[PDB]
């Protein structure tokens, strides 16, 4: 009778998304099987029937490697094969992944790459090829790209860091495109450009892979990123070990995952705008825009009078004052909504908008719909 | 301008579903309002201006007991007012969480319900509080409900815990309502009911209350739960500690929230039916048929034959079996695309389709509605 349970452990955490989505992905191939698998989630650090683990740690590959139960780990891929741990390794392709963002960069615009990786200091390997990732794509490219290795993941001096890091910042060429190993780290630099007043994505353009919906929920500026084949690579995962059950000999397996999309946020929302009294204009706008904006402000903003600051703006862009101060303020309240569960009337306040039907007829006048229908529409 | 930016700190789990959908309802309130704020999401073992913590944890408060920076605390709801802490408190009304599953089995038919929660050791006081509602939500009802103090969710022996929770699990009468403190251990209810062969919904129905996106999947029997209000917690989370960044004058706030809607499965998705044999019967009709099996590999694990089986089936639904065998396979397809991150084609494949012609063909046999109509018009 369709009963044989199969008691699976799995071996990741919830912490990073790029977790939450491997395990979640398990539960995929779980349906297109209906199988009788008694799948459990202990792990801190018996076992049970079979396994599926986070092997881009070596804590758990080193203290594993003794029984022989079907396991098939997961973690970032090597272009050196020798680098990989014993045991089949379905594996992201991390170049797969850094060559994904740096593309979105040269799409937008982007000439100067410079890549803020990691400390070979922490525990974590995968910085490191993705590094060796970033070489090898940019040295086709005219500008070379500069390299930084932060701090630990939250070392002592939390401070220290915040500064030291800052150095790097301000040592690159304007309208660069920094790629963070994670978006994690990419938070370090969001977070950092908005205390030395960097311009962001005019100054600077971040852009980091894990793409968590938790941490880049929150800042003023939203984090741009890639999406790892997370979810896809913790279903393969388990259609393979459900082929190391039957016991299908094989020889080690290494299957690498490309990463999906790359979802687009502000942290790139670059438009070439190559004029300084445009530039730091511009970023205003942006800031400043459902705050209601006039332009006494806007001027010595840029830092620019009147005159000098209309002759200016007036001519790489085109949009008026008028013209930026709304599609500013409009994508503010486009962000509260697809992305920010909230409110519908709520969000036309804190936005600048008199009634409902100056907030709706302002819509349409754009879009072909309306809020309510725009609510759920796109939302994520 | 305003260049007076708080280094704020979050303190939580980014492991639980909880917090998380919490952290990021601060950063819900982070972008109403372009806050000048540095949130700091930390909680590993030096703080900033502004904190949020998971009170519900003690360690956390004799932990910041006696700091002097605003703390607002979040966590569940407490019956006894001088039970909740020191500190001003945004949580959630287990009341209210109990009470909204509670309804959703006064409605789907149950009259007998019971209760599977935390032993007194999972220092978890929200859950002994989840509890105690439910003893007042059964009192004025027919039949007593049941009060089963668990173990542990990674016990000590956990085998033995099997043990227990099977054997008061089978005391309980069928068609019971098991409203599982948490949809972390009320899983722990479908995994042993999948091991002791028990109908789900047919014989008792589960449902847990923290609609965990995790586990969801995991379990061929997709869980219902209660989804929470994590989200407007973490909004006002910050919109108090704004406020306390204002020296303002306010006694300690004490404020709920409700959860909002509570999502359907089938582990509650209950037909009432007390004909043993059409009981079982569509246990592997609702179980492996999407697979696609003889017309006979399902009337004998029921309890009877083919013609002395089916015969009190136009008692259940009115029709036969091949009368429900094309409104029912489709419905193990369906959902893939609700809740699982799949395709069409897949499915098609799976429950048997040509192409996508025939499964837009008996789609509108009950809702005249398209695969491509209702694969958006629905989805999640």
Redesign the interface.
């Known amino acids: 009778?369709?009963?044989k349970?199969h008691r699976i452990t799995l071996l990741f955490?919830?912490?990073?998304a790029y977790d939450?989505q491997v395990?979640?992905?398990?539960?995929?191939y779980?349906?297109?099987s209906?199988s009788?698998w008694?799948?459990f989630i202990?792990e801190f650090r018996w076992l049970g029937d079979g396994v599926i683990a986070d092997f881009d740690d070596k804590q758990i590959e080193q203290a594993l490697a003794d029984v022989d139960v079907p396991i098939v780990g997961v973690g970032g891929s090597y272009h050196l094969a020798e680098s990989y741990p014993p045991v089949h390794y379905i594996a992201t392709d991390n170049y797969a992944l850094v060559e994904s963002a740096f593309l979105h960069l040269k799409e937008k615009g982007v000439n100067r790459f410079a890549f803020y990786g990691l400390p070979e200091s922490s525990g974590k390997r995968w910085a490191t090829e993705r590094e060796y990732a970033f070489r090898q794509l940019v040295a086709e490219e005219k500008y070379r790209g500069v390299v930084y290795q932060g701090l630990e993941t939250?070392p002592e001096n939390?401070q220290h860091a915040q500064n030291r890091l800052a150095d790097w910042l301000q040592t690159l060429p304007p309208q660069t495109g920094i790629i963070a190993v994670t978006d994690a780290r990419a938070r370090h630099i969001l977070?950092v450009c908005?205390?030395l007043h960097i311009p962001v994505p005019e100054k600077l353009c971040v852009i980091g892979i894990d793409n968590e919906?938790?941490?880049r929920?929150?800042?003023?500026v939203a984090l741009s990123s890639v999406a790892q084949g997370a979810?896809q690579m913790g279903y393969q995962a388990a259609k393979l070990l459900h082929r190391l059950l039957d016991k299908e000999e094989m020889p080690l397996q290494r299957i690498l995952v490309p990463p999906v999309r790359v979802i687009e946020r502000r942290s790139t929302d670059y438009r070439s705008l190559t004029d300084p009294a445009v530039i730091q204009a511009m970023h205003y706008i942006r800031?400043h825009a459902?705050?209601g904006i006039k332009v006494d402000q806007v001027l010595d903003a840029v830092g620019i009078s009147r005159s000098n600051l209309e002759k200016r703006f007036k001519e790489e862009v085109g949009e008026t004052i008028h013209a930026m101060i709304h599609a500013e303020k409009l994508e503010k309240a486009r962000?509260?909504l697809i992305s920010?569960?909230?409110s519908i009337n709520?969000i036309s306040q804190?936005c600048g908008y008199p009634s409902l039907q100056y907030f709706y007829s302002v819509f349409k006048k754009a879009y072909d719909t309306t809020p309510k229908e725009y609510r759920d529409v796109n939302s994520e």
Chains 1, 2 share one sequence.
């Open positions: 009778m369709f009963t349970r955490n919830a912490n990073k939450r395990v979640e992905g398990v539960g995929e779980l349906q297109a209906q009788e008694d799948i202990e939250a939390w977070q908005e205390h919906e938790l941490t929920y929150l800042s003023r979810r800031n459902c705050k962000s509260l920010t569960t909230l709520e804190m």
